[PDB]
Design a protein around this ligand. Structure first.
Ligand SMILES: *C(=O)N1C[C@H](NOS(=O)(=O)O)CC[C@H]1C(=O)NNC(=O)[C@@H]1CCCNC1
Ligand SMILES: [Cl-]
Ligand SMILES: [Zn+2]
Length: 358
């Protein structure tokens, strides 16, 4: 890599690892469209297995970017419209509070207070129906954003219904395979388990547990190489030969709602570039990011703005991830770690690196 990249990465990430006690980490810096890879530490401490460019990390909520793009691809195929009522795809949702809740609302956390998590007690399809049938909104649709796995999770599950494919099969066929993300998995196959890092929480090696709508909201695992290619694909959608996927990427970066200086996409979130770094750093703290906030509709949604900071955080019990990119500058970063450490520390390090390289 260019010396300036090596220098800023060492001076930013090695101290972050020191400060946060991260056992293993992989970083990709995309500079002038090209990824440069860096790794530190161990994927499995007790086995002394190093992190490599083939190590799989849990992406946590970064998974939502795949879900958003898959939904955008379904829009571009004409299979769904964001204005469609939820009940078109799940007519058994007969409870009256669902009148007026659209796929847009589900995708963008604006349905009116769907909860952060689907309850752990939901183990079956009938359990899931009962959960949504009994949920009572705190707000009218399209007025407040409350980040929620139960919201975008349902969006993803319904968005694939016209295809006749399972969520996993749709994701593999329509997103992972065309983009050659051949080491990205909703379910890690047995032959790939050897590359699956352990997450570390309070000294214990952990992997994320199964849960309802996990694949859609927080369940993807990937390598630093595949995540760099994901960033490249989102930086340069016109390089994608499959038109529906090119357009799905663009639709996931359209601006559907605004709160403060942040715009909600499909999975992705965006701010105008140049960004105020304190707003992205501070806004990533879970006390802020997970609070309910009023939104202003953008109608029609703003088509993807090249001069944007586009990003997403994610975590599981044992992992912490962050992706950010700036299309106009062909500049991006992926940070994958096998400890869950605070979001503001991730975002601050990412901005120090990208700011140094602009
Ligand atoms: C995504 O990783 N999230 C959603 C939310 N934080 O948003 S973000 O990561 O800061 O962007 C809460 C934490 C995290 C998440 O929900 N991960 N999955 C889990 O926490 C649980 C594991 C087991 C029980 N249900 C989900
Ligand atoms: Cl130094
Ligand atoms: Zn040093």
């Amino acid at each position: 890599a260019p010396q300036q990249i090596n220098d800023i990465v060492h001076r930013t990430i090695t101290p972050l690892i020191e400060q946060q006690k991260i056992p293993g980490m992989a970083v990709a810096v995309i500079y002038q469209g090209k990824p440069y890879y860096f790794t530190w530490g161990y994927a499995d401490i007790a086995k002394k297995q190093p992190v490599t460019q083939q190590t799989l990390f849990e992406l946590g909520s970064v998974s939502k970017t795949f879900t958003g793009v898959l939904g955008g691809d379904a829009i571009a195929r004409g299979e769904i419209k964001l204005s469609d009522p939820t009940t078109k795809y799940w007519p058994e949702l007969t409870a009256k509070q669902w009148n007026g809740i659209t796929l847009l609302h589900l995708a963008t956390y604006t349905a009116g207070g769907l909860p952060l998590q689907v309850p752990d007690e939901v183990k079956s399809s009938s359990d899931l129906l009962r959960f949504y049938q009994n949920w009572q909104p705190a707000w009218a649709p399209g007025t407040q954003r409350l980040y929620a796995n139960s919201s975008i999770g349902l969006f993803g599950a319904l968005a694939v219904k016209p295809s006749g494919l399972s969520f996993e099969q749709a994701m593999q066929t329509r997103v992972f395979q065309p983009l050659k993300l051949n080491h990205t998995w909703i379910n890690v196959p047995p032959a790939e388990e050897k590359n699956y890092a352990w997450g570390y929480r309070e000294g214990k090696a952990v992997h994320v547990s199964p849960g309802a709508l996990d694949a859609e909201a927080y369940g993807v695992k990937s390598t630093i190489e595949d995540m760099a290619r994901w960033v490249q694909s989102n930086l340069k959608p016109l390089d994608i030969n499959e038109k529906t996927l090119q357009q799905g990427i663009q639709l996931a970066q359209s601006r559907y709602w605004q709160t403060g200086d942040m715009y909600q996409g499909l999975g992705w979130e965006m701010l105008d570039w140049p960004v105020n770094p304190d707003s992205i750093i501070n806004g990533s703290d879970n006390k802020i990011a997970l609070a309910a906030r009023p939104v202003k509709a953008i109608t029609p949604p703003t088509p993807a703005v090249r001069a944007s900071w586009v990003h997403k955080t994610g975590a599981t019990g044992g992992f912490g991830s962050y992706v950010a990119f700036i299309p106009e500058k062909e500049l991006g970063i992926v940070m994958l770690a096998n400890k869950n450490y605070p979001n503001p520390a991730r975002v601050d390090a990412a901005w120090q690196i990208l700011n140094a390289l602009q």
